[PDB]
Scaffold this active site. Structure first.
Site, PDB file in Angstrom:
ATOM      1  N   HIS A 138       8.385   4.477   7.508  1.00 34.49           N
ATOM      2  CA  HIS A 138       8.274   3.055   7.828  1.00 34.49           C
ATOM      3  C   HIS A 138       9.626   2.420   8.124  1.00 34.49           C
ATOM      4  CE1 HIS A 138       4.080   3.001   7.216  1.00 34.49           C
ATOM      5  NE2 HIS A 138       4.065   2.879   5.901  1.00 34.49           N
ATOM      6  N   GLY A 172       0.852  -1.168   0.000  1.00 29.81           N
ATOM      7  CA  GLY A 172       0.000   0.000   0.000  1.00 29.81           C
ATOM      8  C   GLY A 172       0.897   1.230   0.000  1.00 29.81           C
ATOM      9  N   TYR A 193       9.460   3.416   2.542  1.00 29.89           N
ATOM     10  CA  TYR A 193      10.292   2.267   2.916  1.00 29.89           C
ATOM     11  C   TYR A 193      11.794   2.429   2.657  1.00 29.89           C
ATOM     12  CZ  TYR A 193       6.036  -0.487   3.640  1.00 29.89           C
ATOM     13  OH  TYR A 193       4.834  -0.952   4.110  1.00 29.89           O
TER      14      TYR A 193
HETATM   15  C1  LIG Z   1      -5.008  -6.435   6.863  1.00 32.06           C
HETATM   16  C2  LIG Z   1      -4.130  -5.606   5.951  1.00 32.06           C
HETATM   17  C3  LIG Z   1      -2.873  -5.169   6.392  1.00 32.06           C
HETATM   18  C4  LIG Z   1      -2.016  -4.384   5.539  1.00 32.06           C
HETATM   19  N1  LIG Z   1      -0.780  -4.008   6.033  1.00 32.06           N
HETATM   20  C5  LIG Z   1       0.052  -3.277   5.220  1.00 32.06           C
HETATM   21  C6  LIG Z   1       1.399  -2.925   5.669  1.00 32.06           C
HETATM   22  O1  LIG Z   1       1.853  -3.248   6.749  1.00 32.06           O
HETATM   23  N2  LIG Z   1       2.188  -2.178   4.793  1.00 32.06           N
HETATM   24  C7  LIG Z   1       1.725  -1.771   3.506  1.00 32.06           C
HETATM   25  O2  LIG Z   1       2.493  -1.121   2.849  1.00 32.06           O
HETATM   26  N3  LIG Z   1       0.519  -2.131   3.055  1.00 32.06           N
HETATM   27  C8  LIG Z   1      -0.338  -2.869   3.841  1.00 32.06           C
HETATM   28  N4  LIG Z   1      -1.556  -3.243   3.368  1.00 32.06           N
HETATM   29  C9  LIG Z   1      -1.998  -2.866   1.981  1.00 32.06           C
HETATM   30  C10 LIG Z   1      -1.794  -4.031   0.959  1.00 32.06           C
HETATM   31  O3  LIG Z   1      -0.401  -4.362   0.913  1.00 32.06           O
HETATM   32  C11 LIG Z   1      -2.327  -3.563  -0.409  1.00 32.06           C
HETATM   33  O4  LIG Z   1      -3.714  -3.250  -0.260  1.00 32.06           O
HETATM   34  C12 LIG Z   1      -2.201  -4.662  -1.490  1.00 32.06           C
HETATM   35  O5  LIG Z   1      -0.831  -5.028  -1.693  1.00 32.06           O
HETATM   36  C13 LIG Z   1      -2.816  -4.109  -2.770  1.00 32.06           C
HETATM   37  O6  LIG Z   1      -2.741  -5.178  -3.919  1.00 32.06           O
HETATM   38  P1  LIG Z   1      -3.881  -6.163  -4.243  1.00 32.06           P
HETATM   39  O7  LIG Z   1      -3.390  -7.040  -5.382  1.00 32.06           O
HETATM   40  O8  LIG Z   1      -4.297  -6.799  -3.109  1.00 32.06           O
HETATM   41  O9  LIG Z   1      -5.138  -5.584  -4.659  1.00 32.06           O
HETATM   42  P2  LIG Z   1      -5.932  -4.335  -5.388  1.00 32.06           P
HETATM   43  O10 LIG Z   1      -6.102  -3.198  -4.435  1.00 32.06           O
HETATM   44  O11 LIG Z   1      -7.033  -4.797  -6.007  1.00 32.06           O
HETATM   45  O12 LIG Z   1      -5.217  -3.581  -6.442  1.00 32.06           O
HETATM   46  C14 LIG Z   1      -4.745  -4.062  -7.692  1.00 32.06           C
HETATM   47  C15 LIG Z   1      -4.987  -2.826  -8.645  1.00 32.06           C
HETATM   48  O13 LIG Z   1      -4.605  -3.271 -10.008  1.00 32.06           O
HETATM   49  C16 LIG Z   1      -5.856  -3.398 -10.798  1.00 32.06           C
HETATM   50  N5  LIG Z   1      -5.733  -4.680 -11.485  1.00 32.06           N
HETATM   51  C17 LIG Z   1      -6.245  -5.906 -11.105  1.00 32.06           C
HETATM   52  N6  LIG Z   1      -5.956  -6.877 -11.969  1.00 32.06           N
HETATM   53  C18 LIG Z   1      -5.225  -6.252 -12.949  1.00 32.06           C
HETATM   54  C19 LIG Z   1      -4.605  -6.751 -14.188  1.00 32.06           C
HETATM   55  N7  LIG Z   1      -4.671  -8.002 -14.580  1.00 32.06           N
HETATM   56  N8  LIG Z   1      -3.933  -5.791 -14.930  1.00 32.06           N
HETATM   57  C20 LIG Z   1      -3.846  -4.469 -14.551  1.00 32.06           C
HETATM   58  N9  LIG Z   1      -4.385  -3.928 -13.441  1.00 32.06           N
HETATM   59  C21 LIG Z   1      -5.063  -4.861 -12.672  1.00 32.06           C
HETATM   60  C22 LIG Z   1      -7.023  -3.269  -9.863  1.00 32.06           C
HETATM   61  O14 LIG Z   1      -8.173  -2.770 -10.496  1.00 32.06           O
HETATM   62  C23 LIG Z   1      -6.470  -2.337  -8.772  1.00 32.06           C
HETATM   63  O15 LIG Z   1      -6.625  -0.972  -9.004  1.00 32.06           O
HETATM   64  C24 LIG Z   1      -2.481  -4.042   4.200  1.00 32.06           C
HETATM   65  C25 LIG Z   1      -3.763  -4.492   3.752  1.00 32.06           C
HETATM   66  C26 LIG Z   1      -4.591  -5.265   4.595  1.00 32.06           C
HETATM   67  C27 LIG Z   1      -5.925  -5.711   4.050  1.00 32.06           C
HETATM   68  C1  LIG Z   2       1.266   0.957   6.453  1.00 34.17           C
HETATM   69  C2  LIG Z   2       0.129   1.061   5.429  1.00 34.17           C
HETATM   70  C3  LIG Z   2      -0.976   0.282   5.546  1.00 34.17           C
HETATM   71  N1  LIG Z   2      -1.077  -0.631   6.619  1.00 34.17           N
HETATM   72  C4  LIG Z   2      -2.346  -1.081   7.181  1.00 34.17           C
HETATM   73  C5  LIG Z   2      -1.464  -0.214   7.961  1.00 34.17           C
HETATM   74  C6  LIG Z   2      -2.055   0.420   4.526  1.00 34.17           C
HETATM   75  O1  LIG Z   2      -3.082  -0.266   4.584  1.00 34.17           O
HETATM   76  C7  LIG Z   2      -1.900   1.421   3.386  1.00 34.17           C
HETATM   77  C8  LIG Z   2      -3.028   1.544   2.343  1.00 34.17           C
HETATM   78  O2  LIG Z   2      -3.503   0.363   1.763  1.00 34.17           O
HETATM   79  C9  LIG Z   2      -0.782   2.183   3.303  1.00 34.17           C
HETATM   80  N2  LIG Z   2      -0.630   3.102   2.265  1.00 34.17           N
HETATM   81  C10 LIG Z   2      -1.406   4.333   2.160  1.00 34.17           C
HETATM   82  C11 LIG Z   2       0.028   4.392   2.456  1.00 34.17           C
HETATM   83  C12 LIG Z   2       0.274   2.017   4.338  1.00 34.17           C
HETATM   84  O3  LIG Z   2       1.320   2.707   4.286  1.00 34.17           O
END
Ligand SMILES: Cc1cc2nc3c(=O)[nH]c(=O)nc-3n(C[C@H](O)[C@H](O)[C@H](O)COP(=O)(O)OP(=O)(O)OC[C@H]3O[C@@H](n4cnc5c(N)ncnc54)[C@H](O)[C@@H]3O)c2cc1C
Ligand SMILES: CC1=C(N2CC2)C(=O)C(CO)=C(N2CC2)C1=O
Ligand SMILES: Cc1cc2nc3c(=O)[nH]c(=O)nc-3n(C[C@H](O)[C@H](O)[C@H](O)COP(=O)(O)OP(=O)(O)OC[C@H]3O[C@@H](n4cnc5c(N)ncnc54)[C@H](O)[C@@H]3O)c2cc1C
Ligand SMILES: CC1=C(N2CC2)C(=O)C(CO)=C(N2CC2)C1=O
Lengths: 273, 273
Positions: A161, A149, A155
């Site tokens: 972070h 995210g 990072y």
């Molecule tokens: C419980 C929890 C804890 C978290 N903790 C952290 C943390 O500690 N640190 C941090 O940095 N983040 C954290 N996150 C955020 C998380 O890392 C991101 O939300 C995640 O990596 C986003 O990727 P995604 O594939 O899941 O999904 P998505 O959000 O769906 O995003 C993928 C994007 O690409 C698009 N897409 C999908 N398929 C394709 C395709 N084939 N081609 C082109 N585009 C496409 C989608 O429409 C979307 O816009 C956390 C999230 C949760 C739920």
């Molecule tokens: C650390 C961190 C997240 N973890 C859950 C706490 C997170 O969910 C998202 C967003 O998906 C972040 N990005 C906005 C900057 C982030 O930095």
């Protein structure tokens, strides 16, 4: 080289970018002739909770259950839960193992962490007599493909972070390398939720591109076990000869073995060391 | 000071030393007049897997499910599942939170990782507008009580597993401090499987006497958010003045903010900032 690959995915949505990344990887590898097996944990409705039910037979000491010893004994006598054994069979077959997942609370998702705990059983995945580079998976290579995210700057050494290299260490050195894996450079795709549609297209293409020559890459650097006294009474500490030779060195050896000195740049992100 | 405590335990066996540790802590805290609530994850038959089943209402976008956004909306409108709501209530009430668990693959057990993922929801546990220092739990304190299989020497700067400080970083800074928690020194009991019956009794007693003044303890040092430019535009990097004024210092600010320099000794194990 390697003809077999295992891809472990830890995401519930097939509409996610992570799912797209797994599909991209499978496609690229098959074109290059690899044999590709998958472990989509959410799709498998995989059980990530360690318990005595992981042992099928009679426990040795049922009134005082010790997971480590009981699981090892079950491994050697052939009575580990069959769902665990099916995963172990996939690992033994694989040369290359790819872990695809979104970073969650600066680590691996709970379902993947449970996979390591239940699948990486003693004797099978590791030995105290042959730790790290001499482990059971020393002829295998592992790679982490992570999505996040937060942006990459968050990072960097000066981001709020903190250094991503520190976050990677427990997984790459502690879990993967401890078992003998040669760990390759991680595929890090930052703030995927704020990446333009066309940039997202390139990310997928760059991943498939890298996998074309993945097996020939030079792995990340970890201090070899030959530098440590491999016996209990010595406490598994660095051999003195080595300890002294390092006293005039500017840099530590790695993230975990920084020795109080400066950690070489991107030790857990870039190879060559 | 504090008067309400929450002890989260992650171990399947009531015959384990971890269970003994949880009983010890509960006993001592009550003696001192605290309100103690418990979260025995295994005994709670706790589900550690995040999914859309964590939301009871209707999703804003059922076609493209995104956990972060949907769970936050659920918190705002009151649609989180019953089990998450109950843990959030325990957390909201607690002044002190103790996390008791055995180290598993250099991290927390999968069941506890899942607890953070499903309970620590946006708005409730954190906001990007008020990260770390200014988080929701800034008036609370948290502590990790960990047991290990390997001895302390293996986890020293010269030990084969590497520095324990790097292992603790992602949990203490990334999960706890990120939501605002003041993190106290971890209670680390190494090689608990090779400790004499007499020594183990001493460990229980030592833990109990520490809990008598736990609230007055000096918390671990983390770089304050005031040192960073908290905006997406700035990339959340450290301020210019700060960077330059830091270039004259020998040690980095912490394990994660080592700045390429030496890591201050036991930054994640001992206070004194
Ligand atoms: C419980 C929890 C804890 C978290 N903790 C952290 C943390 O500690 N640190 C941090 O940095 N983040 C954290 N996150 C955020 C998380 O890392 C991101 O939300 C995640 O990596 C986003 O990727 P995604 O594939 O899941 O999904 P998505 O959000 O769906 O995003 C993928 C994007 O690409 C698009 N897409 C999908 N398929 C394709 C395709 N084939 N081609 C082109 N585009 C496409 C989608 O429409 C979307 O816009 C956390 C999230 C949760 C739920
Ligand atoms: C650390 C961190 C997240 N973890 C859950 C706490 C997170 O969910 C998202 C967003 O998906 C972040 N990005 C906005 C900057 C982030 O930095
Ligand atoms: C999946 C998995 C991964 C692991 N990964 C790691 C790792 O990465 N690094 C690492 O170092 N270790 C690792 N370990 C080992 C683990 O950390 C230890 O096995 C665990 O911490 C031992 O503590 P315990 O409380 O579970 O249980 P126990 O082994 O039972 O030990 C507690 C001891 O104290 C005794 N005892 C119990 N109650 C009391 C009481 N009230 N008073 C006095 N004595 C008592 C017991 O009889 C026993 O001898 C892993 C284990 C597993 C299962
Ligand atoms: C790293 C490590 C372990 N984890 C599972 C891999 C473990 O279970 C034990 C058991 O007590 C260790 N000690 C013998 C030194 C150890 O070092």
């Amino acid at each position: 080289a390697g003809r077999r690959a295992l891809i472990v995915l830890a995401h519930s949505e097939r509409t996610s970018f992570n799912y797209a990344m797994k599909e991209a990887a499978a496609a690229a590898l098959k074109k290059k002739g690899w044999e590709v097996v998958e472990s989509d944990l959410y799709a498998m409705n995989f059980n990530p909770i360690i318990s005595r039910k992981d042992i099928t037979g009679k426990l040795k000491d049922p009134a005082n259950f010790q997971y480590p010893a009981e699981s090892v004994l079950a491994y050697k006598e052939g009575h580990l839960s069959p769902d665990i054994v099916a995963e172990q069979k996939k690992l033994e077959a694989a040369d290359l193992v790819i872990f695809q997942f979104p970073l969650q609370w600066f680590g691996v998702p709970a379902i993947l962490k449970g996979w390591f705990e239940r699948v990486f059983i003693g004797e099978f995945a590791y030995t105290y007599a042959a730790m790290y580079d001499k482990g059971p998976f020393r002829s295998k290579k592992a790679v982490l493909s992570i999505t996040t995210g937060g942006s990459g700057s968050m990072y960097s050494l000066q981001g709020i972070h903190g250094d991503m290299n520190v976050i990677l260490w427990p997984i790459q050195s502690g879990i993967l390398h401890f078992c003998g894996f040669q760990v390759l450079e991680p595929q890090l795709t930052y703030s995927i939720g704020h990446t333009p549609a066309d940039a997202r297209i390139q990310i997928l293409e760059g991943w498939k591109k890298r996998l074309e020559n993945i097996w020939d890459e030079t792995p990340l650097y970890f201090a070899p076990s030959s530098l440590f006294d491999l016996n209990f009474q010595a406490g598994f500490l660095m051999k003195k000869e080595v300890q002294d030779e390092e006293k005039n060195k500017k840099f530590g050896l790695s993230v975990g073995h920084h020795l109080g000195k400066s950690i070489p740049t991107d030790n857990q992100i870039k190879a060559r060391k």
